[PDB]
Amino acid sequence: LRNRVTDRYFRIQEVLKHARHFRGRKNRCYRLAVRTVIRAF
Amino acid sequence: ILVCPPLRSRAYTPPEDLQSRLESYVKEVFGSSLPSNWQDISLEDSRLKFNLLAHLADDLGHVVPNSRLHQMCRVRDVLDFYNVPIQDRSKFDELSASNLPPNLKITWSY
Amino acid sequence: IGIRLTLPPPKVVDRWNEKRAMFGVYDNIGILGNFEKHPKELIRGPIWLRGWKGNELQRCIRKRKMVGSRMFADDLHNLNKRIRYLYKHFNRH
Amino acid sequence: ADNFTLLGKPLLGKDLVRVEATVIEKTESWPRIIMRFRKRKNFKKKRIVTTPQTVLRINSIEIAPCLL
Amino acid sequence: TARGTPSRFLASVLHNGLGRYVQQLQRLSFSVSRDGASSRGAREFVEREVIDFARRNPGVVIYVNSRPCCVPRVVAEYLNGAVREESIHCKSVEEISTLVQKLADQS
Amino acid sequence: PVRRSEKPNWDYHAEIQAFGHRLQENFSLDLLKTAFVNSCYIKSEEAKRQQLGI
C-alpha cells in the first residue's frame, strides 16, 4: 500500500490565508509566508 | 402456488380479560388439579410450557421471543410478559404523535 | 495544481459478492472437524509463507532455503545480497 | 449630572443611586491566537482561544433625594 | 491577527433591550441522518431535547429534516439576516444542547 | 437574491406564529396574516392564475 498526501493544498492554504495582506512574495510563496506568519502570530 | 400472508403488525396491547383468558388456558394445559395458586405453576416441563405459550401466541398473536423463553419460569412470569404493550410505530410517527409545539416542524425524507 | 478538478468515478463495492459472503468459512475446520485439518492449511500463497511469519531477514532466509534452488539467477543473487545486507542491519553492525 | 456630581468614599449608598442594566447578548469573542516561539516548528502548534462575553445595556440611572 | 481580519464597533440590533428584549435568533434548521454514527447525538437531541427547547423559545421556528447525511448540521438564521451554519458531527447531546443554546443567545 | 419563502425550511403558518411570540404580542392570526397581503400581490396572483388557466 502506497500512501501519498492528497490534501496538501488545504494545509498550505491554512498558512497563506494569514499572509494575504503581507507585502511581496511573503504573501503567496508558502516557504516565505510561513516564516512571516509565525512572526506575526 | 404458495402466497405469503401479509406482514403482521408488531403492535400489542394487553387485553383487559387477560388474567381470565390465561386462567382458562392454564386449566386446559395443566388441568383443573391445582386451581389454588395457578399463577405459581412451574413451567419446567417443556411440553406444558410449549402448549401454554403456543396457545397464547396463536390467540393473542404475540409470542415470547427466544431471548425471554428461559425467563418464563412460572405462569406468573408469562402473565407479566403479556401485560407489557408493544408499539410498532416508526420514529417519525412517534415524534409526530407526541404533541409538538407550533414552532417545531419535522420532515422525514425517507 | 496537484489536486484533481473532478470527482473520481464513484466507488461501488459489492459487499455480498460470493468472496465476501463466504469469508471466514472453515476457519474453525480443526475445532469443528475433529482436528483432521489445521486452519493454517487453508492459507494460500507462497510455498515458503504458508502458516509461518517472520521479519524480512527471516523471510529471506526461509525463501532461499525452500525455493532458492528454483530461483532465477538474478533474483537469487539479489536475495543473497539482501540477506547479507539485512544480517548486518538486524545485528547492529 | 450637568451641574452636580456625587462621589462615593469609595462607593455611593444604594439608597442614593440606582443603576439598572439588561443582558441583551451572550456570545464568545473572536478567536485569539496564542503563539510562543519555542525551538520547534511553531505554526502547527498555534493555540486558539475564544473568551465568553456578555453584552449589557444600561437601561437607567436614578438618583434619590437622600443627601441630607 | 487584528490587522489580518475585519473589525466592528460594539452594537445591537434595533437598540435591542432599550424598550424590550427581542430574541434575535428566529430559525434553526437541523439536518439529521436516520442512519449514521455521526448523527447519533443529533438523533438523541431530537428525541429528548428539541421539544423542550422549542417550547422555551416560541419565537424561534425549528425545522428538523431527517435525511441521509454524513455531516449533520444546524443552520441558525437571525433577524438581521445573518446566517450561521454549525456542525454537530459526532457531538453528544450535551454538546449539541450547549451549541444550540449559545446560538439562541447570540445577536 | 430570492425571497426566504422560496428557500428550504419555510412554513408560512409557523413563521407567522413566531412573529407574534417573538415580539411578545398576542396577535390575531387572521388579522396578522391579512397585514402581510399587499394589493400588488393580489393582482399578480390573478394574472398568474388566468394565463395558467385552472
Side-chain angles (χ1 to χ4, degrees), chain A, chain B, chain C, chain D, chain E residues 2-107, chain F:
Chain A
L1 180 69
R2 182 201 195 201
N3 285 338
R4 298 169 76 188
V5 172
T6 70
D7 62 28
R8 195 175 284 107
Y9 167 84
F10 301 102
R11 307 177 188 232
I12 291 171
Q13 293 306 321
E14 292 176 350
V15 160
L16 291 189
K17 77 203 167 179
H18 299 288
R20 304 298 184 195
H21 64 291
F22 296 171
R23 190 175 302 197
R25 293 191 292 158
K26 315 194 301 289
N27 69 22
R28 62 196 96 104
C29 303
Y30 174 84
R31 291 189 175 83
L32 307 186
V34 74
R35 308 206 268 267
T36 308
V37 168
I38 284 171
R39 283 182 60 86
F41 287 1
Chain B
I1 201 60
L2 293 169
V3 179
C4 183
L7 195 58
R8 296 163 298 179
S9 184
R10 279 168 299 185
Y12 173 70
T13 313
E16 202 170 2
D17 56 351
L18 179 66
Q19 177 157 337
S20 314
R21 282 224 274 185
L22 188 49
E23 204 157 349
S24 63
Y25 275 114
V26 169
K27 279 174 173 46
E28 179 181 359
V29 178
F30 300 82
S32 197
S33 170
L34 194 62
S36 176
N37 269 316
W38 62 279
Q39 293 184 33
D40 276 352
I41 296 168
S42 81
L43 296 172
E44 185 160 348
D45 183 350
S46 297
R47 187 185 220 81
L48 305 182
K49 187 176 187 169
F50 171 85
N51 290 321
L52 175 48
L53 294 181
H55 267 134
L56 290 169
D58 269 325
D59 170 27
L60 290 174
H62 183 46
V63 69
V64 179
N66 281 339
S67 51
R68 303 185 173 277
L69 275 175
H70 71 281
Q71 299 184 334
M72 315 287 92
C73 307
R74 291 137 65 207
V75 176
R76 177 181 321 281
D77 298 325
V78 173
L79 188 71
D80 297 330
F81 172 80
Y82 281 102
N83 277 344
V84 179
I86 309 289
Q87 303 89 358
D88 201 10
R89 53 186 184 180
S90 180
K91 248 293 154 190
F92 183 44
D93 306 342
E94 177 171 8
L95 290 162
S96 308
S98 46
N99 71 304
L100 294 185
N103 53 333
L104 183 49
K105 299 294 144 202
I106 302 172
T107 286
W108 204 253
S109 194
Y110 298 89
Chain C
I1 188 173
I3 197 164
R4 60 179 303 127
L5 307 181
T6 55
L7 294 178
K11 209 190 186 314
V12 295
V13 173
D14 179 13
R15 294 288 168 195
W16 292 100
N17 75 351
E18 208 170 11
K19 184 172 223 190
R20 284 184 187 92
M22 292 296 176
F23 180 91
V25 176
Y26 305 129
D27 283 352
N28 297 307
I29 187 76
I31 279 172
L32 307 176
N34 295 314
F35 309 97
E36 283 170 78
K37 269 186 151 300
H38 193 279
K40 80 203 191 171
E41 285 158 67
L42 308 172
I43 304 168
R44 301 289 297 291
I47 197 80
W48 71 94
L49 292 180
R50 282 162 191 191
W52 179 94
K53 187 175 68 167
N55 63 43
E56 193 196 338
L57 173 48
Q58 298 166 345
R59 298 200 296 280
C60 285
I61 289 161
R62 191 173 167 86
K63 182 192 175 173
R64 176 172 66 184
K65 182 171 69 173
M66 298 180 67
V67 301
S69 77
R70 296 166 58 206
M71 286 176 72
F72 290 10
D74 302 332
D75 297 316
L76 186 56
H77 178 58
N78 285 350
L79 179 51
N80 289 318
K81 283 201 291 180
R82 188 57 172 173
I83 288 164
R84 286 189 296 265
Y85 179 82
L86 291 183
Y87 171 90
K88 301 173 304 194
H89 181 75
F90 279 51
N91 295 322
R92 314 170 79 181
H93 294 344
Chain D
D2 183 52
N3 296 313
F4 61 88
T5 288
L6 312 173
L7 286 168
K9 292 170 55 65
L11 293 174
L12 295 161
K14 284 187 193 184
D15 56 298
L16 183 57
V17 55
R18 178 181 193 89
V19 177
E20 297 210 352
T22 299
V23 172
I24 66 167
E25 179 181 12
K26 300 160 65 75
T27 178
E28 78 196 286
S29 81
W30 68 299
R32 321 295 312 281
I33 299 165
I34 296 150
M35 174 83 95
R36 288 97 191 266
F37 195 75
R38 294 154 59 187
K39 296 179 180 179
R40 292 209 81 172
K41 295 179 65 189
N42 302 114
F43 182 78
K44 300 205 175 71
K45 304 181 173 65
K46 83 154 180 177
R47 188 188 165 193
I48 288 200
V49 294
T50 56
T51 64
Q53 303 170 314
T54 313
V55 177
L56 289 172
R57 179 177 295 282
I58 306 297
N59 298 118
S60 64
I61 302 172
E62 300 180 277
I63 47 181
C66 298
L67 291 187
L68 295 168
Chain E
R3 267 170 171 279
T5 58
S7 69
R8 67 175 179 88
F9 289 102
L10 184 63
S12 177
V13 183
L14 291 190
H15 304 108
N16 183 16
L18 183 44
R20 70 183 64 176
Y21 173 73
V22 181
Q23 180 169 36
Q24 298 304 309
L25 180 74
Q26 61 165 328
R27 199 173 301 105
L28 287 171
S29 297
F30 295 87
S31 44
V32 178
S33 200
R34 180 186 73 198
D35 320 303
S38 60
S39 284
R40 179 182 36 156
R43 278 188 304 270
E44 194 179 312
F45 174 85
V46 169
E47 290 176 271
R48 83 189 205 194
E49 299 299 344
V50 69
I51 293 144
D52 301 341
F53 181 87
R55 299 196 208 279
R56 282 199 303 280
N57 309 261
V60 188
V61 185
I62 309 168
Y63 301 86
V64 176
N65 322 97
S66 177
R67 60 169 189 269
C69 58
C70 284
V71 183
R73 292 176 174 96
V74 55
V75 177
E77 295 167 80
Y78 296 80
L79 292 173
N80 72 3
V83 183
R84 166 148 170 178
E85 174 173 277
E86 301 299 320
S87 176
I88 52 173
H89 175 91
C90 299
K91 289 199 177 184
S92 70
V93 179
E94 300 94 315
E95 289 178 327
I96 294 173
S97 295
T98 305
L99 175 63
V100 167
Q101 183 58 24
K102 171 169 71 182
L103 296 168
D105 304 318
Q106 281 170 320
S107 64
Chain F
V2 298
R3 310 136 176 273
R4 185 54 188 82
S5 63
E6 277 160 26
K7 301 179 176 166
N9 307 307
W10 179 265
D11 180 64
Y12 195 81
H13 182 63
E15 296 293 332
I16 290 283
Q17 281 168 299
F19 175 92
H21 291 127
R22 157 182 324 121
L23 299 164
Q24 296 156 307
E25 300 295 1
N26 276 5
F27 278 97
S28 157
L29 292 204
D30 315 312
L31 279 166
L32 184 58
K33 288 191 192 198
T34 298
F36 298 107
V37 185
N38 291 287
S39 165
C40 56
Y41 175 78
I42 312 187
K43 292 194 171 185
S44 287
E45 288 305 297
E46 291 161 356
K48 290 163 58 180
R49 161 181 291 199
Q50 288 181 10
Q51 298 209 1
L52 294 169
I54 44 184

